[PDB]
Design an enzyme around this catalytic site. Structure first.
Site, PDB file in Angstrom:
ATOM      1  CE  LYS A  76       4.620  -0.235  -3.604  1.00  0.00           C
ATOM      2  NZ  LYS A  76       5.515   0.046  -4.759  1.00  0.00           N
ATOM      3  CG  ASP A 107      -3.708   1.818  -1.293  1.00  0.00           C
ATOM      4  OD1 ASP A 107      -3.394   1.527  -0.121  1.00  0.00           O
ATOM      5  OD2 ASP A 107      -3.226   2.795  -1.904  1.00  0.00           O
ATOM      6  CE  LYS A 122       3.272   9.314  -5.467  1.00  0.00           C
ATOM      7  NZ  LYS A 122       3.090   9.868  -4.098  1.00  0.00           N
ATOM      8  CE  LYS A 130      -1.559   2.036   3.300  1.00  0.00           C
ATOM      9  NZ  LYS A 130      -2.420   2.626   4.361  1.00  0.00           N
TER      10      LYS A 130
END
Ligand code: ICS
Ligand code: CLF
Ligand code: SF4
Ligand code: FES
Ligand code: FES
Lengths: 121, 289, 477, 289, 145, 289, 121
Positions: F15, F129, F41, F10
């Site tokens: 990450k 997510d 992104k 997530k």
């Protein structure tokens, strides 16, 4: 060649068998089969017979010549992006949008879509 | 730093004269400007070039075979103050879409390099009598960065302004096209000045300037000369310079939240342009009832 | 000459043209800059020809029937239409083959429907069927029929695809209708595209479901080599001394079975990119067969191409490639030692169809000859991208040159040798400038491989240093 | 024996009121008539129905399942005099051709069979600002047998009439579309009727009538009624009745002769609408030369 | 009909708010969907309250209310009860009531003119959430340079 | 012998930094690796390239002629350690699936042949997510042979790990996709490492490592560099090297056992992350009961 | 029946000959011919295999049953407008959007378009 004419005006899409490479340029086919594409000129400088042609076979797309008249008319209408113009110029592949009075039928399956409106809008 | 602007509006309200006076006022400040007319009639650059019926791109392309043979020198003519003028023209009525002229002109100008030289402003004079995809190319594409709508007290002018505003929000997602602000032309209506400001705030914009009607503009038109080149000391020239200055330092670029037809009806009812009618004799003969 | 002189020459040449033709021709002429990778910034290509300027281009019929479909020997190629198109292209191209002509091979024979005025008015779809029946009657050993359309066929509206399908179903014979009308394209290149499309749609996929062919990891196919003067043969041996097994040649000395067996190979070696990239990409997309371009003009290019092809395979193939290079090294070294001193410093101007204006540059470089100008007739901008990295700086480039442009360029530059087609040979032979036919190798060759390099050098020496070029000026003038 | 007529006119000169009054006069004269309002705005068919903003064919089609599931009773509504009026409507201003509604409405009406019933007159109310796309669709096809142009005194109306005549002459050889005559709406110009007569003479046609302006029309429209229904005894009522009598008895159908822009300027200069511009005053300003 | 975006001082919250604003303008032509105003949740950032108002005006909207963080909300969460039903006399309840009142009489419905990524970067650089870096050692070892 | 690994996690727990540092450690260990940043992104592949906002595959495709004319050299750029990193990107947030970029990038890379070259590790950086659409495309297909989940101390990270494990077990019978282990990013929680170990035990897998938090990572990322390139002698550098050594030597590939929400709450309550809620306090407020 | 599979993922549209009315439901055809429609369930309650089917013949459209499972899934995804639901219920005509795991091939020419994405978006 099998041509499927589709349009919001038409109640149903029409399947037409046509002879490839005739001097009639897919307008003649439309006028023979009653399909009403707006053709409003005799020289080729208007955009009315603008259509969108999809090659349904994909692996049977034929090479064609994009004449400077048709290219200029498509660019004046605004349906010839730089990438498709480059592809037509270099690899001899047809663009997605064509002019139904200058498009010579090839031996493949085509889906011709029009809005019953002039090319510009 | 080039600010590609466009000036839409209903025809017949003196939009072309106001646009040419505005561009001349810009040029008075030393700004390098370029007018790209888009009306089928080449009346958009007849007060700056001091000419009559400037040759259109469509006519030149037709007579010179195709657009690939045309030369920039023939199309692009210079005028007072260095404001280069180009008239797109338009096709004959019965043949094809009538908005091919603007699309052809923009492509020709961008291919020849006219945009890249030094221009600060490039005003597009588009006819907004009917809002269709042919003339919406500056809005549908990302050519017209800023929009300025010329409106008047008459109901049709607003209606056209509302249609243009609805067209702007349709393509706002694709590119950066925003409404700079409404301009006005005084039709000698008493509530005309306060009517447009009642629309700009409701559209989220600002009335950039209210232009008053004067006889000096009309007497300069018959000279084929802009009012700011004709009588620089006139108060009309002062107001046009104020308009140009406001156009320059205009940082309010918003998406024009469109009004509805009834909301436009209510404001015109309020300001006395049209009178409110209620439960009158309808569907009945006047002498009978 | 510098970039300044060349541009002045270009403007002086273009001064005589009408303004529209002048503007159009200004785009097709340029001065080479090797630092430029995108040729579209300099040269436009694949555009129509200006009317009345005496171009050197051809028709789509020449590109399809003359170039691609013609070399196939086991098939019969009907020229549907009047007599002239088929008559003029008969045996004019030196695509060699092995067979009994008129029995099992038909390269140098002219099969035509011979349209009369009664066929232009009443059509020719029944005449085509009767002709197919007669062809089957008189030539029973043919392995297929290809009906190449001429100009009237498209205009009168003849349905040859239907006739081909019906007669193929009837006779169980492969009949391929090619719509290679002369007016369909600006040059022979669209003829190549149409012929490749016909091959893809009517011949190539016959054996998609057949697995009886014994494939090997060393199977390759020679694509875009039409065996001019034996060229393909001189290449094929060079590919079988390295252990590779050439399954098919396309199309010089080619048969309809090799075309069908082509999808069963491990690599496609494409010599002429322009005429066969259309089918190479299709085969890569469908069957997954990789393809690569090789050049067998001159010793240097041949060695580089052999090393690359070997690098495409395992170590044994690379060892065999090194053995072949070592074996052929002294042979071409002797040829260079004999002929380079005679051909050192000479300047060449080339104008050929679509591949050789850049392929043969390496051969002239190996003999110490500088190409001061090259150009094509029907090349695209994928060809000029490849060309700009081959030519030296400040060298002239032209596209679809006219007679006037070429003559004026030659008169100013004054090259020592000119390489072009038959239609320019005598024009420059009356100007006292040696000329070599780079299409048909001037009825000599082959020029591919190490065996062809000796012939290449010998021909260039015999033409440039011929004693006949010193006698044009009369001693009493 | 159905008579297909199309009233072409630029917006802003009260074309809708003249068309509705003429239709009412024809209805009162023992004739069964139908109206198709091809205007993108729903201003047409409002006075006859006595109801503002009749639902358009486009709105009903976008309401549920496009044209195919659209019932003929939903689009056309009976009004004063037993006439059947249907509003065509238009798409969103930003997208598509602004005349797409005309094409959709005509194709829907032909398939449903709204014409095969016993009707004598079918009037298409069409804008004349741009003769292209769906606006020129009735002329391009054989849908409108007779064309009547609503003209006014200003330059724009005459230019629109000239453009419509160009469209008529473009398709003259294909169909039976002909220009019956010119209708004039009074802009209170002193020489308006004579200017329209001169323009009709130059176009090789007749001025079928001249409609004066009076406050009875404004009182009728503010009460959402036709003048004829409001006051059959008024002078304007019999004026409209005479106009209808001339329309139904009209037999002059002629391919027009469009005039150039300079010839159009000649009429305005000759009749005093536009002043004569001397060549010496052009290029030089006041208080300097 | 009305959208209210909950955002915080953290960069991801804005980023999500900007993405939602971009999504709103895409379908604004079809229907009447407008951004009512940004709401905030205090993550105890010093510049958090003034950061969101710097976004609302740039988006053409208004920060409807800045909600402060309190322990009473968290202690009401473990009771599975809202803070206004738990302690009606708490100042948090007074805030929430002010927020609700503002939500009620909110007539500012505008299309949220979206900011770009660099514009969002600049404001966060300005307010000290992240520090501005310029021409530092990049692609080089720390001890080497 | 190409190893296809996907790091699922997530957003908001760093990450991207952990993935880039692990890739750098693998590059310095004599391994040729490739990165595909499937995050919508463009945060991934930024520290390695030392250049902000590498152009995405979606942006380049929309730049000119979609995927078909896109060159392989335009999308992937060589970075530190000789690795080849390419950013996938995402579409407009309002339209389409947010994971469409992952599908387009993977299909483009397969056709171009970016995998057939001699590579040992290909790491897909994917958000956790929502495990659906293009985000679940690597798991739904056989594109990712090993899956490593980046988890944290909060509830959301553990729930995302459980969801990713559910997706792994959904397609277990079809392909060879397996959960190699769990990676933990320090949120400075006192019992974070033990909680991750317990979660891995409940999922039937191993915690491959625990990455502590230190300011050297912040200094490296503020200088647009990896910690390993910034300071090979730092403790975090050898920590990442040990993580890479464990990843390359990992042989425990197992179909996980996803836990229920109540069991997830049990871990948080047990390890002190979430307080134990008594049943008596629920429903009644203070100062009243 | 001729089925033309089109998608942005596919480099070219693929023409496939299929046997009408087989228990394989146009997924089987896609999986046989290598077309990659996202199928992620075995009962029929997800929307992944959502496709858009255009009847190219127009005058050869066959009657079909829109099962309540497929109707509910399409309504959950949001590709079944009220008008098309009414048309399917009353006149037995197929809607424009279908589920490729529940669509039985009929003896006509069809154009099947997918985005390589789940049904919802
Ligand atoms: S096919 Fe082509 S013109 Fe590649 S049409 Fe032409 S036998 Fe030339 S430069 Mo004649 S693209 Fe072959 C050619 Fe080259 S006939 Fe031969 S010599 S290598
Ligand atoms: S482009 Fe043929 S030579 Fe011609 S006048 Fe006809 S018989 Fe004679 Fe090409 S297909 Fe052929 S060669 Fe020309 S005609 Fe056309
Ligand atoms: S879009 Fe506008 S200009 Fe184009 S044809 Fe339609 S009405 Fe005419
Ligand atoms: S009809 Fe004018 S372009 Fe074809
Ligand atoms: S795959 Fe689940 S609905 Fe078809």
């Amino acid at each position: 060649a099998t041509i499927y004419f589709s349009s919001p005006l038409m109640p149903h899409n029409k399947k037409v068998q046509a002879v490839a490479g005739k001097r009639s340029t897919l307008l003649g086919v439309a006028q023979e089969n009653g399909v009403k594409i707006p053709f409003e000129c005799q020289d080729g400088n208007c955009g009315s017979c603008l259509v969108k042609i999809t090659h349904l076979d994909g692996e049977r797309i034929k090479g064609m010549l994009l004449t400077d008249k048709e290219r200029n008319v498509l660019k004046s209408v605004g349906k010839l992006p730089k990438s498709e113009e480059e592809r037509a110029a270099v690899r001899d592949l047809p663009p997605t949008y064509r002019l139904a009075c200058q498009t010579i039928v090839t031996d493949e399956d085509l889906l011709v879509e029009f809005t019953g409106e002039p090319g510009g809008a | 730093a080039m600010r590609q602007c466009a000036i839409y509006g209903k025809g017949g309200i003196g939009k072309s004269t106001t646009t040419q006076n505005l561009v001349a006022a810009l040029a008075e400040m030393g700004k390098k400007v370029m007018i790209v007319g888009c009306d089928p009639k080449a009346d958009s650059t007849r007060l700056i070039l001091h000419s009559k019926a400037q040759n259109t791109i469509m006519e030149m392309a037709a007579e010179a075979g195709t657009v690939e043979d045309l030369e920039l020198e023939d199309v692009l003519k210079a005028g007072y103050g260095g404001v280069k003028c180009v008239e797109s023209g338009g096709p004959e009525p019965g043949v094809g879409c009538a908005g091919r002229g603007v699309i052809t002109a923009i492509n020709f100008l961008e291919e020849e390099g006219a945009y890249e030289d030094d221009l600060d402003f490039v005003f597009y004079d588009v006819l907004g009598d009917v809002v269709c995809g042919g003339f919406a190319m500056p809005i549908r594409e990302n050519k017209a960065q800023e929009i300025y709508i010329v409106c008047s007290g008459e109901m049709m002018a607003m209606y056209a302004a509302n249609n243009i505003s609805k067209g702007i929000v349709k393509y706002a997602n694709s590119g950066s096209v925003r409404l700079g602000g409404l301009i006005c032309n005084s039709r000698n209506t008493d509530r005309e000045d306060e009517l447009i400001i009642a629309l700009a705030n409701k559209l989220g914009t600002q009335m950039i300037h209210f232009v008053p009607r004067d006889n000096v503009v009309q007497r300069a038109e018959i000279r084929r000369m802009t009012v700011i080149e004709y009588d620089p000391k006139a108060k009309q020239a002062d107001e046009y310079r104020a308009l140009a200055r406001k156009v320059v330092d205009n940082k309010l670029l918003v998406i024009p939240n469109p009004i509805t037809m009834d909301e436009l009806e209510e404001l015109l009812m309020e300001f006395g342009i049209m009178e409110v009618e209620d439960e009158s004799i309808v569907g009945k003969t006047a002498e009978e009832v | 000459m510098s970039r300044e002189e060349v541009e002045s020459l270009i403007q002086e040449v273009l001064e005589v043209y009408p303004e529209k033709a002048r503007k159009d021709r200004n785009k097709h002429l340029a001065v080479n800059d090797p630092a430029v990778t995108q040729s579209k910034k300099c040269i436009i290509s694949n555009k129509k020809s200006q009317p009345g300027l005496m171009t050197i281009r051809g028709c789509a019929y020449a590109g399809s029937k003359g170039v691609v479909w013609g070399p196939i020997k086991d098939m019969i190629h009907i020229s549907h239409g009047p007599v002239g198109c088929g008559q003029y292209s008969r045996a004019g191209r030196r695509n060699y083959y092995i067979g009994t002509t008129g029995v099992n091979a038909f390269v140098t024979m002219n099969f035509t429907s011979d349209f009369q005025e009664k066929d232009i008015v009443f059509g020719g779809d029944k005449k085509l069927a009767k002709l197919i029946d007669e062809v089957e009657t008189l030539f029973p050993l043919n392995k297929g029929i290809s009906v190449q359309s001429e100009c009237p066929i498209g205009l009168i509206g003849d349905d040859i695809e239907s006739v081909s399908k019906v007669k193929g179903a009837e006779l169980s014979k492969t009949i391929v209708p090619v719509r290679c009308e002369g007016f369909r394209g600006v040059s022979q290149s669209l003829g190549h595209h149409i012929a490749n499309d016909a091959v893809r749609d009517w011949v190539l996929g016959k054996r998609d479901e057949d697995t009886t062919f014994a494939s090997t990891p060393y199977d390759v196919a020679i694509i875009g080599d039409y065996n001019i003067g034996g060229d393909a043969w001189s290449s094929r041996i060079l590919l079988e001394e390295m252990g590779l097994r050439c399954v098919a040649q396309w199309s010089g000395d080619g048969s309809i079975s090799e075309i069908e067996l082509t999808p069963k190979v491990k690599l496609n070696l494409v010599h002429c990119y322009r005429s066969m990239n259309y089918i190479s990409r299709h085969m890569e997309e469908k069957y997954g067969i990789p393809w690569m371009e090789y050049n067998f003009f001159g010793p240097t290019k041949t060695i580089e191409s052999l090393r690359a092809i070997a690098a495409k395979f395992d170590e044994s193939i690379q060892k065999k490639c090194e053995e072949v290079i070592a074996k052929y090294k002294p042979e071409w070294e002797a040829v260079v030692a004999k002929y380079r001193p005679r051909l050192e410093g000479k300047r060449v101007m080339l104008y050929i169809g679509g591949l050789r204006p850049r392929h043969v540059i390496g051969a002239y470089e190996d003999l110490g000859m500088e190409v001061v100008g090259t150009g094509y007739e029907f090349a695209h901008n994928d060809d000029y991208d490849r060309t700009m990295k081959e030519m030296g700086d400040s060298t002239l480039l032209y596209d679809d040159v006219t007679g006037y442009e070429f003559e004026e360029f030659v008169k100013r530059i004054k090259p020592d040798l000119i390489g072009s087609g038959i239609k320019e040979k005598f024009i420059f032979q009356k100007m006292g400038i040696p000329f070599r036919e780079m299409h048909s190798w001037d009825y000599s060759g082959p020029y591919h491989g190490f065996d062809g390099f000796a012939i290449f050098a010998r021909d260039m020496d015999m033409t440039l240093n011929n004693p006949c070029w010193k006698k044009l000026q009369a001693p009493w003038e």
